[PDB]
Amino acid sequence: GMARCERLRGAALRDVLGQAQGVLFDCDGVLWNGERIVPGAPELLQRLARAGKNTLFVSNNSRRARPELALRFARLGFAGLRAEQLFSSALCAARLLRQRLPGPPDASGAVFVLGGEGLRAELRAAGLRLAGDPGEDPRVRAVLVGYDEQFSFSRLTEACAHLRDPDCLLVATDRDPWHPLSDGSRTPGTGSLAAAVETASGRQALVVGKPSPYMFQCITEDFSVDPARTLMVGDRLETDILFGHRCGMTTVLTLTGVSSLEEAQAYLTAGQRDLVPHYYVESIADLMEGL
Amino acid sequence: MARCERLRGAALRDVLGQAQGVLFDCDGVLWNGERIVPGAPELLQRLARAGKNTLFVSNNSRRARPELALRFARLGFAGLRAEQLFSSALCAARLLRQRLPGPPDASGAVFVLGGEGLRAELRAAGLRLAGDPGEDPRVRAVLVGYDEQFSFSRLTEACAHLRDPDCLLVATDRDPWHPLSDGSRTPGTGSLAAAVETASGRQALVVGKPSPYMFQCITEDFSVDPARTLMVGDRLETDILFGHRCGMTTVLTLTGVSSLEEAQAYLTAGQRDLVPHYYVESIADLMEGLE
Numbered sequence: 001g002m003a004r005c006e007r008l009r010g011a012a013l014r015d016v017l018g019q020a021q022g023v024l025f026d027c028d029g030v031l032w033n034g035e036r037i038v039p040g041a042p043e044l045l046q047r048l049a050r051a052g053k054n055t056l057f058v059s060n061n062s063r064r065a066r067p068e069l070a071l072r073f074a075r076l077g078f079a080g081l082r083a084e085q086l087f088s089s090a091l092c093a094a095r096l097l098r099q100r101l102p103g104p105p106d107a108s109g110a111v112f113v114l115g116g117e118g119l120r121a122e123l124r125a126a127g128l129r130l131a132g133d134p135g136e137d138p139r140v141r142a143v144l145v146g147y148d149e150q151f152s153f154s155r156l157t158e159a160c161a162h163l164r165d166p167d168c169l170l171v172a173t174d175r176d177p178w179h180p181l182s183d184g185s186r187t188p189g190t191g192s193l194a195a196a197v198e199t200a201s202g203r204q205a206l207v208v209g210k211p212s213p214y215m216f217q218c219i220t221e222d223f224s225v226d227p228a229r230t231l232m233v234g235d236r237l238e239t240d241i242l243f244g245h246r247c248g249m250t251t252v253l254t255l256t257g258v259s260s261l262e263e264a265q266a267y268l269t270a271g272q273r274d275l276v277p278h279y280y281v282e283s284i285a286d287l288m289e290g291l
Numbered sequence: 292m293a294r295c296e297r298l299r300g301a302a303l304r305d306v307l308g309q310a311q312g313v314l315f316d317c318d319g320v321l322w323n324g325e326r327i328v329p330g331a332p333e334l335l336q337r338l339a340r341a342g343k344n345t346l347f348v349s350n351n352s353r354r355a356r357p358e359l360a361l362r363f364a365r366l367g368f369a370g371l372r373a374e375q376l377f378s379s380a381l382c383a384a385r386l387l388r389q390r391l392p393g394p395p396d397a398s399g400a401v402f403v404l405g406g407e408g409l410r411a412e413l414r415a416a417g418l419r420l421a422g423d424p425g426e427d428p429r430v431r432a433v434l435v436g437y438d439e440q441f442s443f444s445r446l447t448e449a450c451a452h453l454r455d456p457d458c459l460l461v462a463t464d465r466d467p468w469h470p471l472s473d474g475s476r477t478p479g480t481g482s483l484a485a486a487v488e489t490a491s492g493r494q495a496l497v498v499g500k501p502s503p504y505m506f507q508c509i510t511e512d513f514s515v516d517p518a519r520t521l522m523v524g525d526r527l528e529t530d531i532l533f534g535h536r537c538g539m540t541t542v543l544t545l546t547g548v549s550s551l552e553e554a555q556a557y558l559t560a561g562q563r564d565l566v567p568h569y570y571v572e573s574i575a576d577l578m579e580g581l582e
């Protein structure tokens with residue numbers, strides 16, 4: 001139906017869960033904040049497994065390749081998770097680049113990456129060649145913009161040089177504009193860097209991460225997922241909840257992250273339906289009452 | 292309503308005689324890099340002798356007024372007054388002074404993403420800068436200019452200051468990019484502003500063309516009748532649009548960024564504000580209507 005941002009408790013919670021085949025969790029702001037996990041999250045995931053409900057995970061974080069992200073889950077207390085369940089914007093970025101750059105031998109090119117080691121590793125694991133890697137540098141056939149702490153005017157210029165070639169793709173991991181840190185400060189997100197590259201190159205970027213449907217496409221290619229029977233749980237309205245709506249799932253805003261209840265209710269009175277969560281909880285831990 | 296008809300023969304003589312003076316854009320009109328446009332110096336002289344005032348507008352925020360005056364001289368343009376020169380750096384300094392003169396004796400500093408020339412221009416106006424020697428006052432404004440030292444690090448700082456809602460966000464201009472002599476591009480302030488805006492969740496007050504504030508700077512210094520003034524530039528989305536918004540007559544010259552076909556494309560698309568009244572291959576052609 002049309003989201004009304006109802007608190008998910010009691011019967012509603014029992015219906016919604018029992019109905020669902022599985023849940024898609026965003027990670028940051030939902031399962032953890034920095035190194036401090038959200039109390040109960042580990043327990044919830046376990047009890048979801050006993051109930052026979054599948055779990056998948058999405059993240060616009062392009063800092064950790066899938067292996068290290070799997071280790072992170074492990075180290076933090078989340079047991080029995082497989083790396084195949086993890087879908088980051090980095091992973092999905094690599095997967096798109098492999099889809100768009102497959103070609104006969106002589107068709108291979110390099111990817112110019114504005115981003116960290118984790119992102120590079122993710123691209124290599126998919127079989128992609130990177131510019132700036134040791135050896136002969138093939139013709140750059142793609143520019144990828146991710147979270148780049150080494151972002152510079154020099155490298156922005158370089159990205160644009162590559163993008164002068166209209167046959168060079170422009171991909172971005174996501175459009176998240178900024179992220180909160182532990183000390184209460186913010187860090188610019190790929191969205192702000194993509195904005196710079198797009199503006200400077202006069203180009204539109206193919207975005208893979210939430211709220212782009214492509215991230216969900218990666219997931220449906222790996223697992224049977226019925227959006228009607230899936231819950232999308234996230235902490236950000238403009239990425240997680242909008243994502244859920246575009247994919248046809250039921251959306252649950254959790255309040256342990258970026259967005260607030262009042263922000264959601266503003267979108268509701270404002271009539272921006274696609275930015276309003278069907279339901280909300282204070283923590284994903286609250287979802288355990290329904291098990 | 293502009294028809295982008297070539298200005299030649301009789302028309303050229305009429306239009307010039309009609310005008311009080313001409314507003315010249317600099318890059319792409321008077322010069323390209325170190326190579327002046329043949330005839331340009333000669334044109335200015337013949338314009339002054341004919342009793343027509345000449346002013347100059349530029350979205351270039353690299354050079355403070357003194358150095359820009361030297362550039363003109365050194366390149367062959369003699370007898371120019373510094374008051375005739377209006378850059379985005381200049382008007383940015385003038386705006387920040389106008390918006391921060393509030394009655395409280397408690398003044399603050401401006402955090403500048405840009406080169407010495409830009410900082411120099413603000414110091415000339417009496418503004419204090421972050422990163423200057425001494426106590427650093429409360430940052431009361433962030434200014435985005437052409438910043439070759441742009442970094443993720445500095446972007447992050449800018450956003451920290453902008454967390455304070457009473458801190459202004461100003462940008463010199465929104466030019467997305469600029470062509471260089473060798474044929475390469477360099478990102479423009481527009482791309483840098485896009486990053487700051489996106490990451491700060493803020494809109495910037497733009498000072499340069501096609502914002503009318505550039506013209507406001509000019510009218511406070513000189514009596515200018517837009518109806519009798521010629522706006523000559525090489526860029527459609529800044530110079531020509533600026534011209535229309537100010538109510539002047541527009542002349543595209545082809546020695547720079549824009550092409551005749553780009554203008555004619557806007558014409559068919561029905562975007563009148565981006566179509567030049569007249570056009571010439573060079574500003575040199577304007578001498579045919581003089582003596």
Ligand SMILES: Cc1ncc(CCP(=O)(O)O)c(CO)c1O
Pocket residue numbers: 026027028029058059060061062063147176179180189
């Ligand atoms: C560098 C970087 N990139 C993306 C994100 C968003 C993570 P999520 O909430 O899981 O979508 C974060 C979250 O803090 C981040 O630090």
Ligand SMILES: Cc1ncc(CCP(=O)(O)O)c(CO)c1O
Pocket residue numbers: 316317318319348349350351352353437466469470
């Ligand atoms: C850093 C920078 N900023 C702005 C411009 C455009 C100047 P104009 O054509 O005089 O409006 C240029 C043109 O080269 C530039 O290099």
Ligand SMILES: [Mg+2]
Pocket residue numbers: 026027028029030234235236257
């Ligand atoms: Mg999140």
Ligand SMILES: [Mg+2]
Pocket residue numbers: 316317318319320524525526547
């Ligand atoms: Mg120009």
